[PDB]
Amino acid sequence: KPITALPRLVQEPIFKDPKGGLGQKNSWFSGEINVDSMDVHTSTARAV
Amino acid sequence: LQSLEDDTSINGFEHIAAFHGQPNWCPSPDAEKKFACCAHGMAVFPHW
């Protein structure tokens, strides 16, 4: 289908609590690589 | 049950359980005095 932007599930970086209060991480926004042998302990990116 | 009780928001088990007690939205949501809608001795108790 003619697309315009990313799906809403992968938009917000820190998902809000539905009731309200402390926010929570959004994996669907991004994840993090924490390998020690290659010493990469940083989050990923979405260079749209 | 475990999932429902761990839930805390409007879908949580805590809210539906607290319907029958405190906090009080009874009789009206807005009133200077509040009670519980556990209709006891009324003619609508089985319905409730």
Which chain A residues contact residue B10 at CB under 8 A?
18-19
Indicate the resolution in Å: 4.4
Provide the CA B46 distance to its chain's centre, in angstroms. Answer: 15
Method: cryo-EM
- Probe site for chain A from B6, B9, B14, B15 (most A CB atoms < 10 A): B9
- C-alpha A14/C-alpha A27 separation (Å) is 9
Q: How far is CA B9 from CA A19, B2, B12, B23, B25, in A?
A: 5, 14, 5, 15, 17
- What amino acid is encoded at A12 in this protein? E
Q: Which two tokens stand for residue A13?
A: 């970086």
As a whole number of angstroms, the distance between CA A5 and CA A14 comes to: 19
